[PDB]
């Protein structure tokens, strides 16, 4: 279905973003690739900073310090900016420029 494909895509994007947060030219080319794949796809699911994707991500992740680090980074990115995908891609842009 379309919703299952969307959950698979957001799940794999979060898993690969977690793996990339733990080579900067290949990562910036990766984040440019996923952001162009976001425009062909584009809110209960993407509400603030990906709360509801937790069990989907840690079916395959199983290390909650990675999830807590991602949630803290997205929360401080939201606090610095002051839907959820754009906050992630601006957060992944700050990692890639370092």
């Amino acid at each position, epitope marked *: 279905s379309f919703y299952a494909f969307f*959950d698979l895509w957001v799940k794999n994007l979060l898993i690969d973003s977690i793996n990339w947060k733990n080579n900067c030219k290949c990562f910036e080319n990766w984040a440019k690739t996923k952001e162009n794949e976001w425009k062909k796809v584009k809110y209960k699911k993407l509400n603030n900073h990906f*709360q509801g994707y937790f*069990f989907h991500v840690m079916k395959e992740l199983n290390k909650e310090e990675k999830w807590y680090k991602l949630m803290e980074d997205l929360k401080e990115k939201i606090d610095s900016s002051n839907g959820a995908i754009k906050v992630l891609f601006d957060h992944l842009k700050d990692i890639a420029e370092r």
Partner: antibody
Amino acid sequence: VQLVQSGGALVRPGGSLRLSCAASGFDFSDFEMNWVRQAPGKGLEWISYISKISAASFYADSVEGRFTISRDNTKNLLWLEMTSLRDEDTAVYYCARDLPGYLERVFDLWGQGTLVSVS
Amino acid sequence: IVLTQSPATLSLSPGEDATLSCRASQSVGSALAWYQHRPGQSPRLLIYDASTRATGIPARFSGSGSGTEFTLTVSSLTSEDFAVYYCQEYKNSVPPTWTFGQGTKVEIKR
């Protein structure tokens, strides 16, 4: 394996209450925790969830903004800080343990029950 | 996902087999559990994948169902099997939901 709660308490509406759920016999850090609410003559109703660490915390739609689940995995205590209690929160509060596996979101072993009644 | 316990109150003699149901409004899968709220006691988990059996549960608690129709079959009803049985979906959708049923009830018929 045992989950011992704090016992019931009488609270005025609009007040606050801190439930407790002391676990024993297993590793508290390795298990996800839950809060399940049963009103008199209404049936079971999940209200809260917390993960192995505080990385994820989920609430029912009727309890968001009012209740807060917290855990202390070195003291083996699970709390539910209750705030702005209405008249529909007179219920029995159950402390449940989740099975290993984040997909299997079931309630394996339960607490003794805690009748919270508002007046 | 809306879960409907059609049997509700069930007048059945002890020592007999009792079948139940838990109809889901949406396609859930194998992500459904079953519970037993014995009177004067906490609930306990019986089945956690709509077919399996939890640890510490006798083999007479068996279930089936993988789509929208689910069924718990308890056999040889003892004194403690006359309880209220709940069914919970834990479907892997976003946001995650923990939805129970109304609670079917098994009672002694006379």
